Amino acid sequence: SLPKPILRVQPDSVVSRWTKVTFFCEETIGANEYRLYKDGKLYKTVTKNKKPANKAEFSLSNVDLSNAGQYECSYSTQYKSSGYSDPLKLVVTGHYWTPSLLAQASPVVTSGGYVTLQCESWHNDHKFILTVEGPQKLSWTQDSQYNYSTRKYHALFSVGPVTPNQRWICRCYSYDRNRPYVWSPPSESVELLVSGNLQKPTIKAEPGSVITSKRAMTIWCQGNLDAEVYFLHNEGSQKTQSTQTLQQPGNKGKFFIPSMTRQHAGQYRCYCYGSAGWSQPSDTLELVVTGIYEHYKPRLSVLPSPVVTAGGNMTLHCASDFHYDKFILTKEDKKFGNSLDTEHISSSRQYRALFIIGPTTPTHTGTFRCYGYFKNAPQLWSVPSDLQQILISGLSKKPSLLTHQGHILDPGMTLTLQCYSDINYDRFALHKVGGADIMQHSSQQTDTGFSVANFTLGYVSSSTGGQYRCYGAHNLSSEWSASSEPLDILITGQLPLTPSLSVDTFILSKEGSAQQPLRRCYGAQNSSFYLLSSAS
Numbered sequence: 159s160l161p162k163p164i165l166r167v168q169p170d171s172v173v174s175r176w177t178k179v180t181f182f183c184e185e186t187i188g189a190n191e192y193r194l195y196k197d198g199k200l201y202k203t204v205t206k207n208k209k210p211a212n213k214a215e216f217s218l219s220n221v222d223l224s225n226a227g228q229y230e231c232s233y234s235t236q237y238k239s240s241g242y243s244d245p246l247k248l249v250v251t252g253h254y255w256t257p258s259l260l261a262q263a264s265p266v267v268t269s270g271g272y273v274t275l276q277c278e279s280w281h282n283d284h285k286f287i288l289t290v291e292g293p294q295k296l297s298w299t300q301d302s303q304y305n306y307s308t309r310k311y312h313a314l315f316s317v318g319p320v321t322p323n324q325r326w327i328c329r330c331y332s333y334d335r336n337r338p339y340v341w342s343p344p345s346e347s348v349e350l351l352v353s354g355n356l357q358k359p360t361i362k363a364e365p366g367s368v369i370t371s372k373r374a375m376t377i378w379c380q381g382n383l384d385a386e387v388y389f390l391h392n393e394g395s396q397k398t399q400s401t402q403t404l405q406q407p408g409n410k411g412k413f414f415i416p417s418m419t420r421q422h423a424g425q426y427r428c429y430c431y432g433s434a435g436w437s438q439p440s441d442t443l444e445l446v447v448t449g450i451y452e453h454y455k456p457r458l459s460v461l462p463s464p465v466v467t468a469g470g471n472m473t474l475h476c477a478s479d480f481h482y483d484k485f486i487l488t489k490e491d492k493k494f495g496n497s498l499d500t501e502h503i504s505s506s507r508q509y510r511a512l513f514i515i516g517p518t519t520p521t522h523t524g525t526f527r528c529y530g531y532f533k534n535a536p537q538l539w540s541v542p543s544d545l546q547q548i549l550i551s552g553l554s555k556k557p558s559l560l561t562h563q564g565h566i567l568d569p570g571m572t573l574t575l576q577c578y579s580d581i582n583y584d585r586f587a588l589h590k591v592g593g594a595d596i597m598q599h600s601s602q603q604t605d606t607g608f609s610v611a612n613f614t615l616g617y618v619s620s621s622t623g624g625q626y627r628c629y630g631a632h633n634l635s636s637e638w639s640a641s642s643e644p645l646d647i648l649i650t651g652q653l654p655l656t657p658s659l660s661v662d663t664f665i666l667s668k669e670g671s672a673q674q675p676l677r678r679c680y681g682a683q684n685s686s687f688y689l690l691s692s693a694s
């Protein structure tokens with residue numbers, strides 16, 4: 159008789175509870191009156207009187223559960239009421255406990271593959287529906303199995319085969335068979351991460367891959383410039399979506415973490431979807447959180463000296479009273495070498511690790527820290543040891559020490575050491591032999607025509623007396639330099655004796671600072687060599 163009308167809904171057929179929905183009856187013949195039928199019954203009637211148009215609206219504001227069901231549209235032209243538009247199933251979510259949807263292994267799927275998702279729910283007699291967020295809505299319906307241990311009803315969906323052209327976003331629903339038009343509120347969006355075949359995004363970690371706990375860090379995913387959304391993922395276990403990306407320079411998907419915890423460490427990969435579909439995943443960037451296991455801090459030492467000559471063998475010692483599995487050295491903020499198995503020494507009650515370095519390339523110069531961690535948690539490290547710094551000399555002119563303020567000192571005289579050189583080094587390093595610390599200062603350009611470095615030590619005590627050496631380096635250079643002749647600092651007033659012989663060794667010095675005392679007169683001993691006491 160007459161052209162069957164077209165019934166449309168906004169928003170979609172599956173609407174969340176308590177939201178406004180609108181039906182639209184459309185035709186071209188005429189518009190005398192429109193009628194909306196709900197489940198085979200006259201629900202509403204809109205007349206084109208009191209503005210004249212060709213399409214009629216039916217608003218159902220504040221939708222509740224009772225508004226779910228079949229809807230048809232009929233119209234009348236002249237005095238002919240004509241048939242029905244093909245029915246439209248309005249579905250309302252709510253009334254139930256929210257189901258859970260879990261990527262059974264991981265959301266990761268190489269294109270053309272299937273992933274299994276488990277959908278759980280507490281409801282006794284319920285069917286499960288898995289839908290994907292796409293144009294032509296893909297659905298799957300399963301019966302619920304019951305896990306007697308967890309006392310929960312679950313069903314598994316094998317969603318696939320996953321095509322690399324379309325973004326896959328899965329959601330689950332639970333619903334009673336007897337009332338099909340009423341589903342549960344949708345579970346959390348499970349988005350599948352597809353390993354495409356386009357170029358790989360470079361993944362980066364700006365502050366570093368090693369981060370102390372509770373601190374901030376950022377993960378960048380830069381790559382193809384026809385990319386739209388960047389993802390970060392962990393083997394165990396994360397999903398993160400970035401839509402708003404820095405366009406300058408080029409698509410840079412930024413991720414920000416305010417404070418690092420246990421659940422932020424692990425191996426990260428960057429997945430990416432774009433106009434030409436998905437891309438091959440990034441390299442596995444391993445994020446490491448330290449500061450955890452903050453009870454037993456490891457301790458780091460070095461032998462034979464914190465400063466070794468170029469081309470020598472030198473061992474670092476990572477030790478801890480706690481039975482860690484492995485110890486790892488880090489230079490600056492970066493990992494160094496690899497992990498070594500801990501080794502329980504029977505004598506020192508310690509767990510030991512000997513990082514042997516030989517020969518010493520100028521690359522080993524830096525600040526080392528040893529961490530302890532366990533096998534089952536490779537990304538959760540201990541609290542860093544007190545730093546042990548390494549200097550490596552060998553290849554430049556030996557920068558002599560001025561050694562002013564005298565050569566033999568009495569507590570307490572403000573001792574300062576100057577380290578000069580003919581070669582214009584941009585930085586000098588002073589070291590007291592047998593010590594663990596190395597001092598460094600920016601050299602100042604004196605008028606004469608070279609650089610002098612000021613090393614202001616504290617008040618002279620009995621402990622400040624020893625042997626000193628200075629080293630020189632440039633700005634662009636990572637190579638430190640061979641040290642000068644040893645400076646022997648001698649301290650007085652450290653023995654209850656006054657010499658009258660002018661006791662293994664005997665010292666003799668001028669009232670003025672001589673270039674070197676020979677071995678007023680002073681008296682020392684072979685064991686405690688740098689300690690003296692006299693009056694003449």
Ligand SMILES: *[C@@H]1O[C@H](CO)[C@@H](O[C@@H]2O[C@H](CO)[C@@H](O)[C@H](O)[C@H]2NC(C)=O)[C@H](O)[C@H]1NC(C)=O
Pocket residue numbers: 562563574576602611612
């Ligand atoms: C580097 O250290 C020397 C210390 O020898 C400083 O020299 C002072 O110089 C004044 C005159 O210029 C002398 O009267 C003082 O006796 C010196 N100090 C001492 C402790 O002897 C020099 O100023 C320092 N230079 C820089 C750039 O810090």
Ligand SMILES: *[C@@H]1O[C@H](CO)[C@@H](O)[C@H](O)[C@H]1NC(C)=O
Pocket residue numbers: 469470471472
């Ligand atoms: C170990 O280092 C020392 C000095 O650094 C060197 O003389 C010695 O030859 C090294 N050991 C071996 C086996 O070469």
